[PDB]
Enzyme design. Structure first.
Site, PDB file in Angstrom:
ATOM      1  N   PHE A  77      58.346  87.938  26.338  1.00 25.25           N
ATOM      2  CA  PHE A  77      58.961  87.166  27.166  1.00 25.25           C
ATOM      3  C   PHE A  77      58.386  87.826  28.602  1.00 25.25           C
ATOM      4  CE2 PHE A  77      61.973  84.263  28.653  1.00 25.25           C
ATOM      5  CZ  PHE A  77      61.997  84.427  29.923  1.00 25.25           C
ATOM      6  N   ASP A 123      53.597  95.230  30.723  1.00 24.71           N
ATOM      7  CA  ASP A 123      54.585  94.602  31.479  1.00 24.71           C
ATOM      8  C   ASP A 123      55.846  95.406  31.581  1.00 24.71           C
ATOM      9  OD1 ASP A 123      56.524  92.704  32.417  1.00 24.71           O
ATOM     10  OD2 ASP A 123      56.169  91.121  30.981  1.00 24.71           O
ATOM     11  N   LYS A 143      61.525  92.598  39.382  1.00 21.00           N
ATOM     12  CA  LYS A 143      63.156  92.888  39.458  1.00 21.00           C
ATOM     13  C   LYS A 143      63.770  93.935  40.490  1.00 21.00           C
ATOM     14  CE  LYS A 143      64.146  90.751  35.029  1.00 21.00           C
ATOM     15  NZ  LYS A 143      63.115  89.868  35.027  1.00 21.00           N
TER      16      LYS A 143
HETATM   17  C1  LIG Z   1      59.598  91.951  30.950  1.00 21.42           C
HETATM   18  C2  LIG Z   1      59.551  90.693  31.711  1.00 21.42           C
HETATM   19  N1  LIG Z   1      58.420  90.209  32.357  1.00 21.42           N
HETATM   20  C3  LIG Z   1      58.602  89.335  33.178  1.00 21.42           C
HETATM   21  C4  LIG Z   1      59.590  88.224  33.439  1.00 21.42           C
HETATM   22  C5  LIG Z   1      59.698  87.388  34.253  1.00 21.42           C
HETATM   23  O1  LIG Z   1      60.276  87.470  35.541  1.00 21.42           O
HETATM   24  P1  LIG Z   1      61.006  86.313  36.530  1.00 21.42           P
HETATM   25  O2  LIG Z   1      61.360  87.012  38.022  1.00 21.42           O
HETATM   26  O3  LIG Z   1      62.389  85.883  36.010  1.00 21.42           O
HETATM   27  O4  LIG Z   1      59.745  85.365  36.897  1.00 21.42           O
HETATM   28  C6  LIG Z   1      60.894  88.999  32.913  1.00 21.42           C
HETATM   29  C7  LIG Z   1      61.898  87.948  32.703  1.00 21.42           C
HETATM   30  N2  LIG Z   1      63.129  88.438  33.005  1.00 21.42           N
HETATM   31  O5  LIG Z   1      64.257  87.370  32.099  1.00 21.42           O
HETATM   32  C8  LIG Z   1      65.426  87.436  32.610  1.00 21.42           C
HETATM   33  C9  LIG Z   1      65.486  85.787  32.207  1.00 21.42           C
HETATM   34  C10 LIG Z   1      65.386  84.770  33.271  1.00 21.42           C
HETATM   35  N3  LIG Z   1      66.735  84.480  33.987  1.00 21.42           N
HETATM   36  C11 LIG Z   1      65.032  83.443  32.404  1.00 21.42           C
HETATM   37  O6  LIG Z   1      65.857  82.679  32.377  1.00 21.42           O
HETATM   38  O7  LIG Z   1      63.893  83.062  32.988  1.00 21.42           O
HETATM   39  C12 LIG Z   1      60.640  90.160  31.896  1.00 21.42           C
HETATM   40  O8  LIG Z   1      61.956  90.308  31.226  1.00 21.42           O
END
Ligand SMILES: Cc1ncc(COP(=O)(O)O)c(CNOCC[C@H](N)C(=O)O)c1O
Ligand SMILES: Cc1ncc(COP(=O)(O)O)c(CNOCC[C@H](N)C(=O)O)c1O
Lengths: 402, 402
Positions: free
Chosen positions: B140, B226, B255
């Protein structure tokens, strides 16, 4: 550190994906920007139309400072008190059922493409993965693999692996080409900029948007208007689309939605389109956070209260009339709407758009050439006539000094 | 407005792309969150690992409040004084030549895919548009058309038009499958999460990352790690990858890079990969703005100064040992590293993960079920042992009350 130290440091620790005009700013207020040597400048780029309300507008700054002490991010896994307030405000302001909050402009675009496709399958009845989306040549809506797939500009797609299928490209400002393209019953939508910004402020002929709306409606195709750079008073109205009184099926907003203080974007549309996406089928970590919502509400109020639309309309007319006085063997064209304008510099065996901008910089004004010989003139919508006059004089003396 | 008014308002003016746990927060500090009725809660989600430093951390808040009075956005068309400072700091901290600043997590991913593809063609020599990127099932990395193309989760790709070509998917935590996939000389990179977060905190077997690095190096393939959710002290180290002492070719951060106060992401790598992208070949409006850079520098300092990595490591071990005491006919599994953990609730003819979270909420703790029967336990890295103990007791009483 001197401007030179600044330039040198970025060159060593940062990617070379940009080649900025050599100026190192450190403070900006309203329509002005000050570099590290204290030199003052007129900002005629507005960060690509992101700071329409002028740099560090007090009301937006206050909203940010206020909310940061309370809450900034909870993620959409839980509810927060601000989001719903923002949503009700923006949906009613633009007259759409709902809004889907995102952060950057490309994300608003991606979300629109997903809404169109989902709607095409679940509502229009298109067979799975046969849905198409039409784009106009010259378009620019981001830097993602999908955004560059619909691009006709080699610099954005060249060397960037295989491209996204299902994207058709037709010429901009061409109703016959649209109708021809909409003969395919698998087309779910058409995405267009009311005025192409990055292309060089190319304005379509009057009647074009009205035709696009008629054509799309006739073929049960969604009309997606990318107002990320033209919307929010920039062109002289809330939305550039307002000049022809058309109502798109989906509207994209970004940039000035926060006054340049926070990445906030949005996609608006009615229930029949918005509700095609179910819980968990789309999201974003920062999308819709409390902090961004406060600045957005504040940024929208500034535009309304200070009547920046009409100010943009009046001054734009003055700006264009003055630019058109320049000699044809120098400025081959002047175009725009509101404070979104551009001039075409006749590139010769001596000068080009970059050099004009270098000298313009030397005289107290900041601008950037879009496509080698085009120069955009877009100052914050809070600019006053006298200030506009002073800058016009700077443009004239620089242009006429070559 | 009551929590019910809040819920109702969003339902009417906002897209239904989410189905949040019914709680309406309005203030948060450190590890705590307060709803509109004044009820206090332990935050065991940290906004998907974005607020590792706790909500509204004073040092980050100060950096934001300070910079907003000076400058917020100039766009990368001009230079600003902050960006280069941030760049030098982060590149040296993580030991990479350069950094390419973006806003959201998906953008960091898209940028990584573009770097790999460009590198594959211009450096590796792959024929134009034949370059492939391998992903692990369960991955993801966003919600863009490309991010969902590499997904194995129907909820993210189902009904979202044709997909991005050139993406190969192999099973996660499987070296033989990687080697088998890397036989194709057209593969430019392999992107993996050191621990799959949204999948349900699935931890790979020891030796896996080391094998991935060996395999990638052997096949002249780029190893893209990632670390958007696992990095920045969350797992107990600066990077989850540090547990096996491996150095990826490209590292993705996001994040917690801002402590939840601003959307900031980044991609780090050496010159040979970074410099494949020339001026104008990639960008972002807000990417690298002065404001986001100040909060980022501050957010990174908090993690270092307060030694949040070791705190995360110690407490995680306590948390897991305590969770493993719960009855097997309730909790079938407990897993994680540092403060990134999860338990698998045996869904039955009575309860499920959602209900546990509803009651957990009623007892003063906030969490969210990832895939119907998995519950993530990820509290801000500033949590103290006693506070952790109190929350563990809440988890126990809730679990044992069904
Ligand atoms: C490991 C990882 N890589 C990339 C992303 C994407 O980041 P975004 O800032 O959301 O673009 C993530 C995604 N984290 O997921 C949280 C869920 C999000 N609210 C969803 O609904 O899109 C991660 O974990
Ligand atoms: C009309 C339009 N739509 C979308 C976007 C994309 O917004 P982002 O916020 O940049 O994601 C834009 C923006 N284009 O100007 C940004 C140029 C930037 N330097 C680049 O390299 O991406 C517009 O205009």
């Amino acid at each position: 550190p001197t401007s030179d130290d600044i330039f040198e440091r970025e060159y060593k620790y940062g990617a070379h994906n940009y080649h900025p005009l050599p100026v190192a700013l450190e403070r900006g207020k309203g329509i002005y920007l000050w570099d590290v040597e204290g030199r003052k400048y007129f900002d005629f780029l507005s960060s690509y139309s992101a700071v329409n309300q002028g740099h560090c507008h007090p009301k937006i700054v206050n909203a940010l400072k206020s909310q940061v002490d309370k809450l900034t991010l909870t993620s959409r896994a839980f509810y927060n008190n601000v989001l719903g307030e923002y949503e009700e405000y923006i949906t009613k302001l633009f007259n759409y059922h709902k809004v889907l909050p995102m952060n950057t402009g490309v994300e608003a675009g991606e979300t629109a493409c997903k809404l169109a496709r989902k709607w095409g399958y679940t509502v229009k009845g298109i067979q799975k993965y046969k849905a198409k989306i039409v784009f106009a040549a010259g378009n620019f809506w981001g830097r993602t693999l999908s955004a560059i797939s619909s691009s006709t500009d080699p610099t954005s797609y060249d060397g960037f692996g295989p491209f996204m299928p299902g994207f058709d490209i037709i010429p901009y400002n061409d109703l016959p080409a649209l109708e021809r393209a909409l003969q395919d019953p698998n087309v779910a939508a058409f995405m267009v900029e009311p005025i192409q910004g990055e292309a060089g402020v190319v304005v379509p002929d009057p009647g074009y948007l009205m035709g696009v709306r008629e054509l799309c409606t006739r073929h049960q195709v969604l009309f997606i208007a990318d107002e990320i750079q033209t919307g929010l008073a920039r062109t002289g109205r809330w939305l550039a689309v307002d000049y022809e009184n058309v109502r798109p099926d989906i509207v994209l907003l970004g940039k000035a939605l926060s006054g340049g203080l926070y990445p906030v974007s949005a996609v608006l549309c009615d229930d029949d389109i918005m509700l095609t996406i179910k819980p968990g089928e789309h999201g974003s970590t920062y999308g819709g956070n409390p902090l961004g919502c406060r600045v957005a509400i504040a940024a929208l109020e500034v535009l309304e209260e200070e009547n920046l639309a009409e100010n943009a309309d009046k001054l734009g007319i003055i700006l264009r009339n003055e630019l058109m006085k320049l000699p044809s063997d120098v400025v081959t064209a002047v175009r725009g709407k509101g404070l979104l304008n551009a001039i075409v510099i006749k590139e010769t065996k001596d000068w080009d758009a970059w050099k004009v901008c270098l000298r313009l910089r030397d005289n107290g004004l900041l601008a950037k050439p879009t496509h080698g010989d085009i120069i955009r003139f877009a100052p914050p919508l809070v600019i006053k006539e006298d200030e506009l006059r002073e800058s016009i004089e700077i443009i004239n003396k620089t242009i006429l000094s070559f």
